[PDB]
Design a protein around this ligand. Structure first.
Ligand code: SB4
Ligand code: LOT
Ligand code: LOW
Ligand code: CA
Ligand code: CA
Ligand code: CA
Ligand code: CA
Length: 345
């Protein structure tokens, strides 16, 4: 294929003639993104150029990690790959990686709406997040930083999770307490806390826990969910942190029906099951999909799990050129999916 060069975001992109009319649509993890027209299929796509993918061992392994992850993800509510390309003609020339996915116009902060979101629409948005989470969690992949800006949404409110399984001032307002505070253990339900925070905000229009720092955020959290028991202190290594939490005046759990006034009682019930400090008591994604709040959308035949995902590479320290060669192998071996991968139920 013939490549052309175009300066976008103050740097040269080199892309196949197949992709036309590139225009910038923001930064992504470790890269920047342009919308484009795929002349082969007439579809709109998003192309991410990775930033300095082989600058160091940190960049090189994260490049491999992201390409391996996205090549594995085949779910309608999870970002996956239509294409991956490089202008390089050989490994010796290889220094740039571009990832292609279906174009999604917005993020959840941008969701098209008429004054306020109906409950039916909130159900659909949260349902899709949970369906995507069930899939990634089934491959032992956790997001860890799920938030509205990591949910890509199109013009028909179809949603995909992105920037999962990876790793500028980020918002911490949606992070699970065990993540924000570096507790010693956690599980996949860190992401369910984030879903609760997102859903709460879709129902009220206001951030659930808009803390100014981690201590302020923890205090806002404890006002809703109540003071934790001593069992939770087991999870916290720092004595000063444990002493602080233990020293706080006791607070009762709030009745969520008094917080989310006028909400669907099923929405309130689901929030009570997600916004639990005890991550071992938190509802899982698969359990949440069966909750009556989603009754009009739930379809067990269309809530699939993932194929097994081999992450053994994560424990390995390899040289930069080894990560680079492995990444090149993954570029060259990529098989584009069929354009139409779905059938009537
Ligand atoms: N508009 C759009 N549509 C789909 C995805 C993205 C995208 C990607 C991305 C990931 C993988 C890939 F192969 C191609 C693109 N990374 C960040 N974003 C956007 C997510 C919403 N805020 C702007 C950046 N952007
Ligand atoms: N935080 S609040 O008191 O401003 C507030 C705002 C909005 C709401 N709410 C509605 O109106 C419908 C569902 C819902 O949760 N509840 C509380
Ligand atoms: N946004 C909130 C939700 C709960 C009631 C009120 C407003 C105090 C708070 O700490 C808990 C934060
Ligand atoms: Ca169906
Ligand atoms: Ca079809
Ligand atoms: Ca479709
Ligand atoms: Ca069926």
């Amino acid at each position: 294929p013939t490549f052309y060069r175009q300066e976008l975001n103050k740097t040269i992109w080199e892309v196949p003639e197949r992709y036309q009319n590139l225009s910038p649509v923001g930064s992504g993890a470790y890269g920047s993104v342009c919308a484009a027209f795929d002349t082969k299929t007439g579809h709109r796509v998003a192309v991410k150029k990775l930033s300095r993918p082989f600058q160091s061992i940190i960049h090189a392994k994260r490049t491999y990690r992201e390409l391996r992850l996205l090549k594995h993800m085949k779910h309608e509510n999870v970002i996956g790959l239509l294409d991956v390309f490089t202008p390089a003609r050989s490994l010796e020339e290889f220094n740039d990686v571009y990832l292609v996915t279906h174009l999604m116009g917005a993020d959840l902060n941008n969701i098209v709406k008429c004054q306020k979101l109906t409950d039916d629409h909130v159900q659909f948005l949260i349902y899709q997040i949970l369906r995507g989470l069930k899939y990634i969690h089934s491959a032992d992949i956790i997001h860890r930083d799920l938030k509205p800006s990591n949910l890509a949404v199109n013009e028909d409110s179809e949603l995909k999770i992105l920037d999962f399984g990876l790793a500028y001032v980020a918002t911490r307002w949606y992070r699970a307490p065990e993540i924000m505070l570096n507790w010693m253990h956690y599980n996949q339900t860190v992401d369910i806390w984030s879903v609760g925070c997102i859903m709460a905000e879709l129902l009220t229009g206001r951030t659930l826990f808009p803390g100014t720092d981690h201590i302020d955020q923890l205090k806002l959290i404890l006002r809703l969910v109540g003071t934790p028991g001593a069992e939770l202190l087991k999870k916290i290594s720092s004595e000063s942190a444990r002493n602080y939490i233990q020293s706080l005046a006791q607070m009762p759990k709030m009745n969520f029906a008094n917080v989310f006034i006028g909400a669907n009682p099923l929405a309130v019930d689901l929030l009570e099951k997600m916004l639990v400090l005890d991550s071992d008591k938190r509802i899982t994604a698969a359990q949440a999909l069966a909750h009556a709040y989603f009754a009009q959308y739930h379809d067990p035949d269309d809530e699939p799990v993932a194929d097994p995902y081999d992450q053994s590479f994560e424990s390995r320290d390899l040289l930069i050129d080894e990560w680079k060669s492995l990444t090149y192998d993954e570029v060259i071996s990529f098989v584009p999916p069929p354009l139409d991968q779905e059938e009537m139920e």
